[PDB]
């Protein structure tokens, strides 16, 4: 399908930074509260990445007010304004779904350092 990939290659973002599973990432998204328009942050650990070109996505997990919150972001969506890595983590897997059953000090991730 050269047709569909031509239609999709003109919509993809060109400044998406490098991240991997285990990283702590702050995401800034556009919010519209009425008719004025603001950016809001979502900061947590990347537990999953899906790679499909325009259909790429990544899942961010954070602990908010003593509650677990997961957010799947569509990567090339114009709601997502910026992606920024705050810390690089060292894991062995591609999917950190075992972090769902761990809390507190059982959920620490080593920094890669190399």
């Amino acid at each position: 399908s050269n047709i569909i990939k031509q239609l999709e290659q003109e919509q993809m973002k060109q400044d998406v930074p490098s991240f991997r599973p285990g990283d702590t990432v702050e995401v800034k998204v556009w919010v519209v509260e009425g008719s004025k328009k603001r950016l809001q942050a979502f900061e947590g650990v990347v537990i999953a990445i899906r790679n499909r070109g325009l259909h790429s996505a990544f899942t961010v997990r954070k602990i908010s007010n003593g509650e677990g919150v997961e957010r799947v972001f569509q990567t090339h969506s114009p709601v997502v304004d910026s992606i920024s890595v705050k810390r690089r983590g060292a894991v062995r897997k591609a999917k950190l779904y075992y972090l769902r059953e761990r809390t507190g000090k059982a959920a620490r991730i080593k920094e890669r350092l190399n």
Binding site: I3, L7, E8, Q11, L54, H76, S77, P78
Partner: peptide, 11 residues
């Protein structure tokens, strides 16, 4: 030809 997605300006 198939299915895809179109993003609009308001997200």
């Amino acid at each position: 030809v198939g299915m895809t997605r179109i993003f609009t300006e308001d997200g």
